[PDB]
C-alpha cells in the first residue's frame, strides 16, 4: 500500500515502476466497441462482481422465479384480459408505489420532478413550439381561469416536456405463432409534447404542484389525426397520458439511464486504467466510484443492448433505432461535458436554483430531484476539492503531471471517448478544472445513477403507469374507448412480464454505499477528508428526512443511505 | 510467467520470493468452517467466477423464469392434481431423458450403473443382510427359476443397494399459511434395501428383485415388495429412488466431489509457491471450485436453502450425513481411488467369473471412468517426471512436505489416509494423489453432476423427499395416493429449479486450461493428454452404439476441467 504521489515528484526508480504498472494496465484494459459504443475488450478478473454481489443478484432472480410461480400471467403475446390483472403481477414482490394512484393527473405530473426521469421538463420561455398549437381557450378551460397563455408564460408558470428526440425512431417489430401460423406485428411510436402549469394553490390545502394541461401525442399537429388532448377528454386523456409515459420511459432508459450514467462513465474508467499509476492520487480518488462499473456495462452489452435482449424486446423502436438514440445522447453529453454539470444542466432547462420570480421564489418550487441532488453535488465538490488540495497545491503541478495530462489526452481522443467538452484550450491547466471534472464523474456514478435507476421499480414495474412500448395506435378522438382498447395499447402478457423482470433486477439491492469504500485511504489526511464527507452525508440525510415530512410525497432515492458509491446495477 | 521449479533448487533470493508469495497467499486463503465443514474464510476476488461464467449462469436462471411463466404449476403446498402434470413442467426446457421410460424396471435398475449416483451398488457375497429376509420362494417367483438365493450368490449374480446410511435422519419439516392458519407437516424418511440380479437373457441387464423400504423387517408394517406387487411395487421404487437421491446429493455429490476438494485447494494456496510445479499442475483443476463451494454454503446447505427445502432430513440431519461422508473419504483417501473403490464394492474390472467375464458386464460409469482415470494417471506421471526424477527431490521439497502436513493436520482437512509412513517419500505416491484429485475434480464430478437434470428434474423418477408414509401392502392405491407421496407443487418446482441450474452449462473443459504452461515440455505433456482424450471420446462413441442406451456424461467433451457448477 503506497502513499499516493504525483509522478514528477517520484524518483527515477519509482517512475519506472509507475510506467511498468501502467503498461500492464493498458494490456489488461483494452478498448473495444459494440455498435459504436465504447466498451472494454475483455474484463479483468479484478473488475468482476464480488461473491457478495453475485449472491444478492441471484436472490433477485430467484425471487422472480417465485413471483412468476405465484402469478397468473402467461407466456403469450395476447393482452391481459382485465386492466386489474396488471395489479395482480406482484404476489411475492413489493407493490410498486405508483400502483394505486397512477391515474391521478397530479401523480402523472409529479413524475417529471420526482420519478425515474426527472431530466426532461423545462420552463417555457417566450412561446410554445409552433408545432404545438395550444390555445388560450384550452388553457382557460383547464385552469378555470381568464389568464391567457402569453400571460402565464410571462409569469414563468408553464413547463413543457418535448419528446421530439424520439420522432425518428423506426418502430420495433415482434412476431409469434398463433394456431400454426406466424403473426407479425409492429409497435406504435410516439413523440409527444406535454404542457404543464405550476398551480400555486394546489387543491385548496396549499401544497402547490405541477398540473398537466395538454398532450399532443405526435410532433406534427393535425386536428384529426394528431389533436391536442386535455383533461376534459375523458378516456382519450387517459390514453394520451399512456403515450406520454411510454415516451418518458424510452427517453429514460436510452438517454437518462443507459447513455448518461452507465455508458458515459466507461471512458473514464478506461482512461484511469490506461494512464494513471495505481498510486496516482486521482486514481485512488476515483476507483471506489468505479467499482463494478465495467462489469455492469458488460452485462448491459450482453443482456440489455444485444439482439433479443431487453431493449430489443421492450422499447418502442427497433434495437437499431434505440442504439442510435443512445449514441446521440452519449455524443451530446461528451461534446458538452461540463455543460452537463448539475447546476448548469438545471439552469439550461430553466429549472435551476437561480430560476426565480421577482420575489425570489423558484418558478418550480416542488422539485425533489433538484433539491436533493444539489445537496449531494455540493458535498461531493467539497470532498473532491479538499482531497485534491492534499496533492495539488499549485497549478504547475497539474500541468507537470504527465499521467494526468495523458489521462486528459486519452479522454478527448477519438478512440478514448471523444470527450471534446472536457477541457478548455486543448489541455488541463488548473486545479479547479480538475475539481469540477472529478466532482461530475463522482456525482454521475453515485447520485445521478441512483436518481434514475432506483425509481424504476416504483414507477415502471407497474406496467400501465409507464409501459416501455405501446402496441396499438391512439384511437381517433371521437371513437369510443373500451377496456379492450386500452388493453391492446398496453403491452401483451409476455412483454409485461419481461418489463417487471428487468425492473426488479435493476432495483433489488445496493451494491455499495456513497462515501464508504471497501478499503481505507493509506494517506491519513485523505481518510480524514473522507470521514468529513461521511459526516456531511449524515447531515444531508437528516435534512432530506425533514424535507420529506413536509413534501406531498416522500422522495427517498437521494437519501445518502440509498445512494451507491458507483454505477453498479 | 516463470519457469516452475522445486524450492530446494532455487537461489536464496528466489527462495525468499517464493516465501513472500506463500505468506501473502496464506493471508488471502484463510481457513474457516460452517457446521464443521472446512471452507475458505474470504474468497479472493481472483477466485471469483468469470464474467463468461456469470453470463451463462444468468442465462440459466432467466430460462427458469421463462419456463415458470409458461408452466401451469402453482406456488402451493398442494399435490399436483394429476400425475401427468409432472410431464408438463418443461414447456421451455429440454425434456429430462428418463421421463418417458422411468416406470420400466430396467430403467430403474440401470440408474445404479449409469444414473446420477453410480456409486452404491455392490455385489452380494456370502449372504444378504440378516435384516433383509428375502427367501428362496420369493427369489424363484420373481426370477421364474428353480435356482436358490444361495446358488445365485455363489455365482455372483446378486447385487444390493443398502441405504442404511439414512436410517438415523430426523425427518424434515415444512410449514405454510393456509387460511390464516399455520400448517406444519413432516416428510417421511426411508432407508431401503434393494436386491438386484444380473439377468443374462434379453440383452443382458440388471433387474430389480426386491425392495424393503425400511431397515427393520416386519411382514405387515415393513414387508418385502417385489415386481409382483403391482402399484405397491411402483411406490416402493419411489422410496428407493428418493433414498438414492439423498445419498446422491449428500454423499456422492456434495461431500465426495465439492467438499473433499476444498482442503486440497486451500493447501495448494497455503503451502505451494505460484511457480511450484504441483501448484501449476493442480490449479487449472481448481478453477471456480472455491467459488462454487461458497455458493453451496450460501444457497445449498444454508437455513432455507435447497437442501433444507428439498431433502428428506432436517438440515442438521443432512449436514451430519455430509460430514460423515467427508470423514470416511479423508480417513481412507487412497482407498477411494477409482480402481480400489470399485473393487471394494465387488464391481471392479477384476471382479470376473470363472470364464473371465465381469459379474456386472454392463457398467458404463466404470468402463468410461477407468479410461479417464488411466489417461489422467499417465498425464500426471509424465508431467511430474519433468520435475521429480528421484525420491530425494520429493523428500527435500519443503513446500511439498508442508502441503502434506497441512492436509493431514486436524485444521487442514484431516486427510489421514493421504500418505504412508507418516510422510510423502516417493514420486509414485504423489502421482497417485494428484491423479485422484484431478479425477475427482473433472470426471467424478461430471459423472455425479451432469445426470441430475435427466434423472432428477423429472420429479417422479427421483423425488428428493417423500411426503406420505408407504401405504399398507393391502390398501388400494389411487392416483391421489401417489400424488400425496410425491412432492407438492412448490417443492417440485424448487427441485426443477435446482437441477436446471446445476446442469445448464460446462464452465470449462477437461484438458483445456485457460493459460498455457510456460514450460514447453509441460505443454507437450498436456498436448499428449489432449490427444489421449480424443482417442477416449471415439472409443466411448463406439461403445455407445452397442450399449442399450448411450452414456454420454464421461465423454471428454462433456467433462469439465474442474468442479465448478
Ligand atoms: Fe443502472
Ligand atoms: Fe456440482
Numbering used by the authors:
A (entry chain A): 1 to 569
B (entry chain B): 1 to 202, 207 to 569
From the publication, what sentences describe this entry?
Lipoxygenases (LOX) are key enzymes in the initial step of lipid-mediator biosynthesis. They catalyze a regio- and stereo specific dioxygenation of polyunsaturated fatty acids to yield fatty acid hydroperoxides, which can be further metabolized to a variety of signaling molecules with diverse biological functions. CspLOX2 is the LOX with the highest relative amount of bis-allylic product reported so far, hence it is a suitable candidate to study the molecular basis of the dioxygen positioning at the bis-allylic position.
CspLOX2 crystallized in space group P212121 with one homodimer in the asymmetric unit. As revealed by sequence alignments of CspLOX2 with other LOX12, the N-terminal C2-like domain, which is a common feature of eukaryotic LOX, is absent in CspLOX2. A well-defined boot-shaped channel connects the surface of the protein with its active site. The catalytic non-heme iron, deeply buried in the CspLOX2 active site, is coordinated by three invariant histidines (His257, His262, His449), Asn453 and the carboxy group of the C-terminal Ile569. The sixth ligand of the octahedrally coordinated iron, which is positioned towards the putative substrate-binding channel, is a water (Fe2+-H2O) or hydroxide molecule (Fe3+-OH) acting as a catalytic base for hydrogen abstraction during catalysis. We also found a putative channel in CspLOX2 at the same position that might serve as oxygen channel as well. This putative channel connects the surface of the protein with the base of the substrate-binding channel at the opposite site of the iron, which is in line with the antarafacial oxidation of the substrate and a high dioxygen concentration at the pro-R face of C-11. Despite extensive efforts, we could not obtain crystals of a CspLOX2 substrate complex.
